Amino acid sequence: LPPGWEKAMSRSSGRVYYFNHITNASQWERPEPARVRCSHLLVKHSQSRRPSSWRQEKITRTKEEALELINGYIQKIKSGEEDFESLASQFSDCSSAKARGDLGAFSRGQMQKPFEDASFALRTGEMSGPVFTDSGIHIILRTE
Numbered sequence: 001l002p003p004g005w006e007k008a009m010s011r012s013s014g015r016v017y018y019f020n021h022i023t024n025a026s027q028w029e030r031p032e033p034a035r036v037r038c039s040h041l042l043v044k045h046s047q048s049r050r051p052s053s054w055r056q057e058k059i060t061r062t063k064e065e066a067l068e069l070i071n072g073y074i075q076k077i078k079s080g081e082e083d084f085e086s087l088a089s090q091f092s093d094c095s096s097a098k099a100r101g102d103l104g105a106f107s108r109g110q111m112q113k114p115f116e117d118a119s120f121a122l123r124t125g126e127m128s129g130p131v132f133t134d135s136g137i138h139i140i141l142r143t144e
């Protein structure tokens with residue numbers, strides 16, 4: 001399949017699914033651009049390189065607590081209960097929250113590598129799983 005995909009077996013149901021080890025995306029169905037546009041939702045934690053945001057002057061949550069928050073947001077976005085944009089605007093620990101998480105367009109070479117690799121491995125309209133950087137934990141949405 002496309003870059004980074006492996007076949008796996010559901011631990012609960014036993015049904016085949018597909019997992020991407022670059023984006024941390026997972027899906028039931030069987031699955032590089034010079035520039036991409038992405039949005040993100042960042043949840044910071046106490047070990048983030050800058051443990052502060054517009055939401056909270058001192059970010060004290062643990063990495064484990066941050067991951068739980070990220071996992072919950074992913075659930076709500078995938079279920080359609082919430083839009084990615086809505087959750088980014090409300091809960092992202094990044095100044096880009098004011099722009100619905102939009103970071104604009106970019107080529108490779110500009111940023112932290114796990115974020116870059118995930119961004120360039122996503123298809124248009126596809127969303128990542130939890131992506132870990134020195135900043136915290138990200139959900140990334142490729143928009144263009």
Ligand SMILES: C[C@@H]1C[C@H]2[C@@H]3CCC4=CC(=O)C=C[C@]4(C)[C@@]3(F)[C@@H](O)C[C@]2(C)[C@@]1(O)C(=O)COP(=O)(O)O
Pocket residue numbers: 042049050094103106110111112115133134135136
């Ligand atoms: C890992 C994220 C993603 C970064 C952005 C990727 C795209 C980009 C390309 C550029 O050419 C210039 C800027 C951006 C838009 C980008 F690099 C930056 O905004 C920084 C981003 C969000 C980031 O590193 C961050 O979350 C820093 O947060 P803290 O510093 O608080 O730890």
